[PDB]
Design a protein around this ligand. Structure first.
Ligand SMILES: *[C@@H]1O[C@H](CO)[C@@H](O)[C@H](O)[C@H]1NC(C)=O
Ligand SMILES: [Ca+2]
Ligand SMILES: [Ca+2]
Lengths: 145, 145
């Protein structure tokens, strides 16, 4: 069970697509719960689920849509270990694709520094790149970066 | 069958659910042969349970003007989804006692003549009831067909 997020400009927000070993397929909204979404953000290294958006808000998914329904405890590391329950085929359509917005949305990089690990801090927000202010920037911030 | 009871009306079962969405033509001899989603596959819970009321389900009560159930009144028996009276022929003291003890009114009892008012003039289901010594319930006493 390999999940991924597509169709989103935000780094940790997009439409849910689960790979069943070889094929990529979308997930219907009625088959996704809060516990399953929390596992998906954790597996994708995005931290915490913020919202669950149905109706193909992030992007009209293509390909097949699986009728598998996730019955998730909530503490599973991956979607693969989470028990699921099959359903009769053809239950859901394309217009009800599930979307997930996780927490880790900020993107920061270091540029123009000769070393890849050293450089001025640049942060992208509202569709533009810019340089972070030095004021109130200290060693604790630097270590996390 | 006369009724198919749902929503755990009869009771709540603790065992795991074995079948889901049973579709049967009604003529198959064994319950297994009917179509289902899969053996041991389910999406319900224990709160949903299936009950059945068969044709030969018998209950006993006394009908009176004041109350539907009373310690004195007309004797009624329930069979094949219908209520029926019982004839007075071959009536015995032991049979009267067994009727009273089954419904928890008294130990012995007595037969009073017919009252002035009778409800709906329901038919007779059984006649010539002869009760031996020993059976607490009326179902064990021989009678006419
Ligand atoms: C059984 O079905 C009959 C016929 O529909 C109905 O009158 C009766 O109320 C039902 N009994 C129960 C207990 O559901
Ligand atoms: Ca079902
Ligand atoms: Ca059926």
């Amino acid at each position: 069970r390999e999940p991924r997020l597509v169709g989103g400009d935000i780094p940790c927000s997009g439409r849910v697509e689960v790979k069943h070993g070889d094929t990529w397929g979308s997930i219907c909204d009625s088959d996704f719960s809060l516990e399953a979404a929390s596992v998906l953000c954790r597996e994708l290294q995005c931290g915490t689920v913020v919202s669950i958006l149905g109706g193909a808000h992030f992007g009209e998914g293509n390909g097949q849509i699986w009728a598998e329904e996730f019955q998730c405890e909530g503490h599973e590391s991956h979607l693969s270990l989470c028990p699921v329950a099959p359903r009769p085929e053809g239950t859901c359509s394309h217009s009800r694709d599930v979307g997930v917005v996780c927490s880790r949305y900020t993107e920061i990089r270091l540029v123009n520094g000769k070393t890849p690990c050293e450089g001025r801090v640049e942060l992208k927000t509202l569709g533009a790149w810019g340089s972070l202010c030095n004021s109130h920037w200290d060693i604790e911030d630097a270590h996390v970066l | 069958a006369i009724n198919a009871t749902g929503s755990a009306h009869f009771g709540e079962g603790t065992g795991p659910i074995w079948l889901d969405e049973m579709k049967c033509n009604g003529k198959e001899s064994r319950i297994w042969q009917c179509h289902s989603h899969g053996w041991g596959q389910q999406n319900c819970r224990h709160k949903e349970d299936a009950g059945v009321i068969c044709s030969e389900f018998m209950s006993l009560r006394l009908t009176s003007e004041a109350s539907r159930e009373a310690c004195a009144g007309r004797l009624e028996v329930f069979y094949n989804g219908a209520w029926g009276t019982v004839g007075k022929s071959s009536m015995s003291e032991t049979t009267v006692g067994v009727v009273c003890r089954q419904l928890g009114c008294a130990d012995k009892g007595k037969i009073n003549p017919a009252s002035l008012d009778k409800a709906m003039s329901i038919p007779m289901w059984v006649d010539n009831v002869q009760c031996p010594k020993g059976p607490d319930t009326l179902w064990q006493c021989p009678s006419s067909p």
